[PDB]
Amino acid sequence: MKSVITTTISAADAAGRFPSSSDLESVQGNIQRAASRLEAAEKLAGNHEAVVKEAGDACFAKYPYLKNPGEAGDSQEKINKCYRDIDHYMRLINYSLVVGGTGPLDEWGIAGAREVYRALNLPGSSYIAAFVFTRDRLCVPRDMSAQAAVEFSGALDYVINSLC
Amino acid sequence: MKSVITTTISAADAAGRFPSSSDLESVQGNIQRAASRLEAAEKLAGNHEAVVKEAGDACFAKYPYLKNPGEAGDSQEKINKCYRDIDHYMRLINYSLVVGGTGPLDEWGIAGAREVYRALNLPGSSYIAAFVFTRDRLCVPRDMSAQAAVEFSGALDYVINSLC
Amino acid sequence: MKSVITTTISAADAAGRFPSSSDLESVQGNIQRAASRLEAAEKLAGNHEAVVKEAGDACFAKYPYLKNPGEAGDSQEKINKCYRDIDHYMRLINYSLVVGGTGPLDEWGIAGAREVYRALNLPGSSYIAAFVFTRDRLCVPRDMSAQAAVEFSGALDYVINSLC
Amino acid sequence: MKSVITTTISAADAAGRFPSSSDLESVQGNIQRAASRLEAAEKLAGNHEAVVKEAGDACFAKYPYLKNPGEAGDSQEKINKCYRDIDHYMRLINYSLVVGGTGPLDEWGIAGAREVYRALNLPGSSYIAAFVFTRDRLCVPRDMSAQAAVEFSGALDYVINSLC
Amino acid sequence: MKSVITTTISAADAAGRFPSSSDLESVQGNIQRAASRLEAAEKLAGNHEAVVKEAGDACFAKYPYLKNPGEAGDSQEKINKCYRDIDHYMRLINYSLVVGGTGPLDEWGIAGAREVYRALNLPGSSYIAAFVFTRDRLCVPRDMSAQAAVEFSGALDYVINSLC
Amino acid sequence: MKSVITTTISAADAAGRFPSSSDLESVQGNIQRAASRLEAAEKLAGNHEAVVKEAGDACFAKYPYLKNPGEAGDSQEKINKCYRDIDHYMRLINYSLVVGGTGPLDEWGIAGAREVYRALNLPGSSYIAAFVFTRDRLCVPRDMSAQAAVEFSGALDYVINSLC
Amino acid sequence: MLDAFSRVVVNSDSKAAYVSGSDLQALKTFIADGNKRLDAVNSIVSNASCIVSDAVSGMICENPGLIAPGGNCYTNRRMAACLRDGEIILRYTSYALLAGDSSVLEDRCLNGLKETYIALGVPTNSTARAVSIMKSSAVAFISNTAPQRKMATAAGDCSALSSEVASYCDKVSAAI
Amino acid sequence: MLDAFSRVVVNSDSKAAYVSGSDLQALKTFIADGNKRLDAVNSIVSNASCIVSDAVSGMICENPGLIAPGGNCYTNRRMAACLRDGEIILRYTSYALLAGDSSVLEDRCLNGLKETYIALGVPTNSTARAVSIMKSSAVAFISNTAPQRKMATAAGDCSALSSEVASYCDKVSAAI
Amino acid sequence: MLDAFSRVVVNSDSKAAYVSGSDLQALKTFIADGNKRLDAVNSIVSNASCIVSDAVSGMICENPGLIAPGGNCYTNRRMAACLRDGEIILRYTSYALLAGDSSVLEDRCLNGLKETYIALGVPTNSTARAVSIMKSSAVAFISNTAPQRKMATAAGDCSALSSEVASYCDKVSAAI
Amino acid sequence: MLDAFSRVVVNSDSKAAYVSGSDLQALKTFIADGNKRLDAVNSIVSNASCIVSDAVSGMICENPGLIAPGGNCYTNRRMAACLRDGEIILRYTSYALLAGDSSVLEDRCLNGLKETYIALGVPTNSTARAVSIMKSSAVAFISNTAPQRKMATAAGDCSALSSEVASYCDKVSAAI
Amino acid sequence: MLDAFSRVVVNSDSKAAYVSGSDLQALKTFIADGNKRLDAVNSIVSNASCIVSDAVSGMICENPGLIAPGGNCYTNRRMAACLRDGEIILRYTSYALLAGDSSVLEDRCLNGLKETYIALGVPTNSTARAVSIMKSSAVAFISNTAPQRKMATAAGDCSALSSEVASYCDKVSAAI
Amino acid sequence: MLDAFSRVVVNSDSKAAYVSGSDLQALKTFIADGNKRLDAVNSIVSNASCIVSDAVSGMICENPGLIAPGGNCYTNRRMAACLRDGEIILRYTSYALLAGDSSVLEDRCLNGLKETYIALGVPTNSTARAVSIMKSSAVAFISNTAPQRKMATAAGDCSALSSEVASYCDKVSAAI
């Protein structure tokens, strides 16, 4: 896990000290941000179905070769698995926005994802295309506020950089 | 120098990761509490001489035995060293308020202060008395705002807890 | 590097022992399989241009999407670099056959290739397709002897498993 | 047990890799040298009693002082224990020839042998004399083939070097 | 429990050796000095109540501020605890004289005493005053022999140095 | 150099403490036993040539086989080196008696003697016979006082145990 | 470890569910009480030495056998270890209060603490008494009801945070 | 670790006997089948990624709850750990096949694997299913019957090595 | 390490002076531009892989000898470590930008980096070229002038932050 | 670790008592017998190799199954381990004799030795036999009654030290 | 490390010579003054903190720039480092005095101390002043001429041990 | 570490070239002489103790000052260090002979050997003499011309391997 509170408390514990002024200051940083990230998280939770479907459609349109036999999307079951993976990543992004840090993403969708995608012949470029489409598709303020958009695009960019 | 920025950057570097949403969040909290701690620091820097004088007067009034021969403060030079000693602590508290963390205090007035004070026969109770007087002398808003007072008293309490 | 001689000498050095019956026995096996593995290396060295060209053509035929803009292979320079790194891998396979172990491959083409290909958006499946075409294109005894073919296909499979 | 197979597999396990071309090459060397190894081992197993008798007789002939009181061969009991020790070493040499490495010797007759012989007043020169006599008594092709002789003399020389 | 015997035995065990000439020689020194240190221990055990009461009286006479509210000794309970602490230290000094080393003091009165006294606002200067009074109060051959006095004052000085 | 002083000082340094009662007690043991061990050292230094000659004569009388070709002592140079080795050991025993510990012996004659004697075919039983003859040949107080004899025989037994 | 938000996402992850509106509202209430929680943590931390020393002294006064020979607080070494353990428990309780979740407390302090204290012979009843005195003093500091030290905060009801501190201390007491 | 030759030696050492003619003949048969054994090991290692990925995928497809929340293959971290542990099991099975003895397998993989998986919560039945799919795939690769891979080898019977691979996989499954 | 506030403190501590009004005003200016600085750091980190890969690729394309044999970027190992070094340099540049001070960069990345590269034979001119390309790309991302990526922030002037990024990259280049 | 003086102090510390006259007189007897104790320790250490080799050889002679295959003294490695364990036990017995207390032995050699031997398969009966032979030889050396090695000491009674050595060896035997 | 006896042995070993009569007489003089040497070591160690505070305070008062900002004794951290270094130097000087040889001091304190101090920026002149003040205080305590505290010893000339302490301190000063 | 084949590969990698026919024929000659090379390594290792002891003894006999006080072979500790030092040199020479390349010898034995010997005061002339005696004895054993020990090998010209051993020993001598 990884968040503002977890980071500052882990640092204090490693130094074996009570939470000092800096730790409280970091928690105030969490407080101020919340609104934006929590809003972004609320919109993602209420609109994930469509967002995940759009991301998967863009992923399979950019790389139609996935539908070829022996590729990651040769079967409708594997296409559904791809949309489910995009759903999982979007849910982890929502968890990161709620948490205020890349913790849920790092632990549940990033750590070991490289080995899994190598083993299952899943090109990281497909996930990258889906998340890039989701990031560029977001519009301000029809979808979220400017800072909620900043949080959403930051989480998406973190996933993209983890995959590239 | 322990502060919000240094703590989060050290955590990121130990993890070998770029500054993520949580680190920017923590820096945002530093931004929000900066007005508070900087007002406290402005008060301390503009009125430190009288604050230090009052703290030293309280320290020697609570412990007149310090003037006795062999004790710390039996000479005018040692009393002046006491007032300068409290002045150093108050300057470190000003530094802590400026950085938003106990880093300056930790590294410059607390680390090794225990060994120094037991080697030079400087009772920690005297420093504690001076800082307790400084903390309880603080008035809102006669001295500073409520949040600046919170920061100032937090720094003073950190010094006190370091001395006990 | 990594070979029979290197492995057994490194084991002896780790145990701090003179070469013993087992190390000489392993080098005897080096001697015995050198004929087939060096015949495979010689054929690869003498016909590497055709093999590399065929592997690159198969890689681009299985994945024409690499020609699309923004993909690895969207420019003639990047296609030339595709054939160049295929040639690099085939040369490292020749080096592995000459050495008798995957040492040259491990150190010069496999170590770090994961990070390189992730950073440069080089899908490992394309390399896999080229090497699979090379492996399945091999004909016995037209191209080389049965045991030379075993060595060559083992090196190719080692590269493939390093990528997948 | 130190052998070709165990050395290569231990190296691969330490590197956490599947058996590669070099490991199979080393096992091929085990296959090729096994003929001479097992010929020497079978001859030693079939004629060990006479070989052990000759080695013990030579050991006590070169060092008659062992029969003096307070020495290692000061009684028939420990003269028989000397012959049993030579039989143990010859059996371990048979095991080494069967295994293809010094493993059995290292683990069962050499490890801790120095401490035992120092503690029990057993001069290593007597063992060395027995094994030197066994090594120089071997006749080719009367006792075994030239390469079986190489394996047998190598095991004996390994024991001698472990004792000197 | 640090003493001559324990020090030499621990050194030999760390080097994994039997007690050698130096270890027996150190124990011989224990034999030589036991007369003086056991005379000191016997005298202290026989007259400890007066010594402890008198060290406590000296401690509270040098620091009458300890009776002030908020200070160690502000109540009869805490004054009795002060005398009990001086009794504990004198008993540990008796133990040190008995064993011939600072072991009992190190493990039972000195280790952690710094943290305990800082947490409980017990100034080290008060303990130092009590022990300095006890040390300078001793008279030769009035209270004990010259060398018994040397050992007793050495234990007291060790306690003082541990507190300063 | 292991002695009473060095052992106690090394223990104190490892604990990072000043010399305490136990260290001074151990040095008092140095003082007490110095008379006997230095008397032994003086007698050995004054009569070492004849002692070494007798020890070497006894060594070669116990093991005349050492004169046989291929053995340690088959040449006049090797016999002279045997007598010189006994002289070296007696000099190190004199050094141990002067020092009060086995330090000089451990560092200069014992450490690595196992490997040296195994490599050069020097039977430890010969050294043991020489030192046993020297130990049993000593007479009280014809050669030295009872306690000087105790220290001398202790050093000799230490050498013997290092060899057996 | 986990904080309140990470606790919420862990609970949501148990059903592959995005963070629901109810959980989001709970975390928004957590954020709105941000200074409530931060002032509570500041109250605990600024008086941490006071809390720990007072709790250990009270546990000793109510159980004088602890400072008797054979008692677990006799030998200044053991007494300093007791003060250190009280400080550590209060530190992890402050961590839990700051995080709004006891995962840090349990995982990094309470995991194996019972077995450790049994192995060392640390009395569980005396440890529970010291932790309970720490709980009472810390709760008093949260509510600014400490008789001898008052911290200036905006008027309000921090009973939720006092109950949270009490719950963390009860977790400590039940772990042993 | 032990190989077939060292296993024979250890069995002979328990009797303080020189390696008998029967044991020598068994090891000579091992040597005569050595090229077949090397081909079998090459077949396994040349398709190790395929074997492991296919087995994990089949284990998941037969037990879809593994990738459900709370399932032990959910969380790409857990999936990567599962693929890694399956690859480790196949690696040690290949070590045993190359050595002709299961000593390396048990000692370096299976010793404490059951306890480790119980502590981690790794499902024993799903792990056994994955190991059994690895068994079938490895056996097919030994006998070159794998429908999607034909390793060119000289014609002959490798059913002894296939049975050895099956026995190693059975030993893995019985260990857990 | 030090940040801007701690740098001001260290400068003030050199003369035993309380942080003066001018230094305090500079720090309030730092705080007021704090949101801009956070957006700059976000721009760098969100495109960090792009920046590093593009810079290393430009270094290679302008010096094709780096990927030739004997070149320091031939051998995928040497090349991946080049990418890692670029990523590390950009990571510490982002640390310095976030902190408003180059102390973290100088102490943790550049101290001994030149001697390390000399020992390894890493060409300092090529490293400087890669760092300069990272500087150009990072400055473009700060100013949101990146040709193939725009990140939306409220319109304003951040030339000071891009100048700071350029100064950190120039410190990197000067160190080598 | 503890010695006789440390043992007396620990016993006194239990009652918060200054070392009584009886304990002081006991330790004065210990000191007055200190020369005899050094005599005894010298007699043991000067014949340590003799004692250990003789004890292990006798344990083997009465039980030739120890050196038979499967026995715990077969395999020169195991033989050297047995001689090393005998030497270690005698070394800690000599430590206890020199210290006048068994704390060093019980805390550094016997602590966990029984379970270690059980796990290793070291026979407790044979170990006890070896320790008993070490006891007999060490006691004979204390009393200077060893038939083949007499060490010159002033005439006196060291039966107390012989009984102490026997008590330490009996403690070793009871621990296993 | 070497003591006086070890130093004599090392000197004799360089000539492959048994310890001569003159060296034996010198060591006998060392032993006869051994009680004086223990007296002196006790006097130093019983006032170790006294001596260290005396020296560091005098060095600071003579050079007030050490406690000014940028001085090496300003910042309680550096002040405690200075006090610890003074205590360490005094401890190794007492080791040398007890051993009657500089070997322990040279090998464990002064070896590399000059270069360490130069790298740290520790002023060699101020360190030498502190060491000289320690020398004065230690010499006064050896001769029992300290004005404030006297230690009861039998009347005699300890000028040799005082000169030895002075030589060790001057050796410290020469090393730095 | 490199062998002959890896040396050829490394040389061809510098030119980005597939292993040429000439280098392939050279390695084929290496393999065809592989039995001779194994016999040479067997001759060296079977007489390793003889070679090392004889070389060190000859170095001592030609330079008797080495075993005099102050010499580098006086003090059995130093003598055994010298014997192990020469044994290590011979072991790495045998590694080089087995590999057909001096890479292992240079990198794992000679890298820093000269500086280490200078720091320890090991005489380089005496080390060179011992290594040269090792060279002569090892070459004699390769050619089966050792007067006191003959090994039954096939008749042939092993002068290439003897010259290789001489070259490795000359590399050792030049390194120091």
CSV table of C-alpha atoms in Angstrom, one decimal, chain D residues 1 3 5-6 9-10 12-13 16-19 24 27-28 30-31 34 38 42 44-45 48 52 87 90-91 94-95 98-99 104 108, chain H residues 1-3 5-6 9-10 12-13 16-19 24 27-28 31 34-35 38 41-42 45 48 87 90-92 94-95 98-99 108:
chain,number,residue,atom,x,y,z
D,1,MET,CA,27.2,-35.2,-3.7
D,3,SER,CA,29.3,-34.7,-9.5
D,5,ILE,CA,25.1,-33.6,-12.8
D,6,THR,CA,24.9,-32.1,-9.3
D,9,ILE,CA,22.1,-28.5,-11.5
D,10,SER,CA,23.3,-26.6,-8.4
D,12,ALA,CA,21.4,-23.6,-12.5
D,13,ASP,CA,19.4,-23.5,-9.3
D,16,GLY,CA,17.3,-20.0,-10.8
D,17,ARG,CA,17.4,-21.1,-14.5
D,18,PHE,CA,16.1,-24.2,-16.3
D,19,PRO,CA,18.8,-26.7,-17.5
D,24,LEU,CA,23.1,-31.1,-21.0
D,27,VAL,CA,25.7,-34.6,-18.6
D,28,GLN,CA,26.8,-35.8,-22.0
D,30,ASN,CA,29.2,-37.8,-17.7
D,31,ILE,CA,27.7,-40.2,-20.3
D,34,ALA,CA,31.0,-43.2,-17.4
D,38,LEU,CA,32.3,-47.7,-14.1
D,42,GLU,CA,33.5,-52.5,-11.0
D,44,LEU,CA,37.7,-52.1,-7.5
D,45,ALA,CA,34.4,-53.5,-6.2
D,48,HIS,CA,38.8,-54.5,-3.2
D,52,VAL,CA,43.0,-53.2,0.7
D,87,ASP,CA,38.6,-50.3,2.9
D,90,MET,CA,38.6,-47.6,-1.3
D,91,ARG,CA,34.8,-47.9,-1.0
D,94,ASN,CA,34.5,-46.7,-5.8
D,95,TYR,CA,31.6,-44.4,-4.9
D,98,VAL,CA,30.4,-44.5,-9.8
D,99,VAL,CA,29.2,-41.0,-9.1
D,104,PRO,CA,31.4,-39.3,-1.7
D,108,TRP,CA,32.4,-39.1,3.9
H,1,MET,CA,21.5,-32.9,-3.8
H,2,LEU,CA,21.7,-36.4,-5.2
H,3,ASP,CA,21.5,-37.8,-8.8
H,5,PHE,CA,24.5,-42.3,-9.4
H,6,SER,CA,24.7,-40.6,-6.0
H,9,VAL,CA,26.0,-44.8,-3.9
H,10,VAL,CA,24.0,-43.7,-0.9
H,12,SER,CA,25.3,-48.8,-1.2
H,13,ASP,CA,26.8,-46.8,1.7
H,16,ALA,CA,28.9,-50.4,3.7
H,17,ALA,CA,29.1,-52.1,0.3
H,18,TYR,CA,30.9,-51.4,-2.9
H,19,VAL,CA,28.5,-50.6,-5.7
H,24,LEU,CA,26.3,-50.8,-11.7
H,27,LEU,CA,23.5,-47.0,-13.8
H,28,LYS,CA,24.9,-48.3,-17.1
H,31,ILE,CA,23.9,-43.9,-19.1
H,34,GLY,CA,21.3,-40.7,-21.2
H,35,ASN,CA,20.8,-39.2,-24.7
H,38,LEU,CA,18.9,-35.2,-22.3
H,41,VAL,CA,15.1,-32.4,-20.5
H,42,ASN,CA,15.5,-30.3,-23.6
H,45,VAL,CA,13.0,-26.6,-20.9
H,48,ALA,CA,8.9,-24.4,-20.0
H,87,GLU,CA,7.9,-22.3,-13.1
H,90,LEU,CA,8.8,-27.2,-13.3
H,91,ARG,CA,12.4,-26.2,-13.0
H,92,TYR,CA,13.0,-28.5,-10.1
H,94,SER,CA,13.5,-30.8,-14.8
H,95,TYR,CA,16.4,-30.9,-12.4
H,98,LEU,CA,18.2,-34.4,-15.6
H,99,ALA,CA,19.6,-36.0,-12.4
H,108,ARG,CA,15.1,-27.5,-2.6
